[PDB]
Amino acid sequence: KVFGRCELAAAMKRHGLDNYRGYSLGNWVCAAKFESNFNTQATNRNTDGSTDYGILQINSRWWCNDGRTPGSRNLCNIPCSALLSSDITASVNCAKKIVSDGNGMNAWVAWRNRCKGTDVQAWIRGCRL
């Protein structure tokens, strides 16, 4: 499923990400724009044994089990397939999870390189939220 940016803002709002650990809603929308282009189904497979999965691109060495990743900790306690759903819950309880431990929103290399200085409130200007 690919979302609209306003329709993912509002879902994310609903799933209480607006200001969790101090990160404006607005960053969370940016992080998934530049991590998967709003596609619930995205995967990037790496040389390294691991795969980034879903809309916020959560890796398999650390966060989910997909039974094929080397040094696995499955710290979200979810199968990675759980994160390619069209529904974004399993991925938001997993980003909340990542963001506790040592969060930056830094965990996500697109938020660091493309959302970190900007006006991220720009990704929610115009939505009803």
Among 7, 18, 52, 66, the active-site one is 52
CA atoms within 13 A on the CB side of 103: 12
Can 52 be counted among the known catalytic residues?
A: yes
Dihedral angle, C-alpha 51, 94, 108, 99, nearest 10 °:
-150
Can 7 be counted among the known catalytic residues?
A: no
Q: Is 101 annotated as a binding residue?
A: yes
Residue 59's domain comprises 1-129
Q: Answer positive or negative: Cα dihedral of 100, 104, 106, 108.
A: positive
Resolution (A): 2.0
From edge to edge, which strands make up the β-sheet containing 51-53?
43-45, 51-53, 58-59
The total number of structural domains in the chain stands at: 1
Q: What angle separates helix 5-14 from helix 25-36, to the nearest 10 degrees?
A: 130
Residues 64, 59: Cα–Cα separation, whole Å: 7
Experimentally, how was this structure solved?
X-ray
Question: Which CATH number does the domain housing residue 46 bear?
Answer: 1.10.530.10
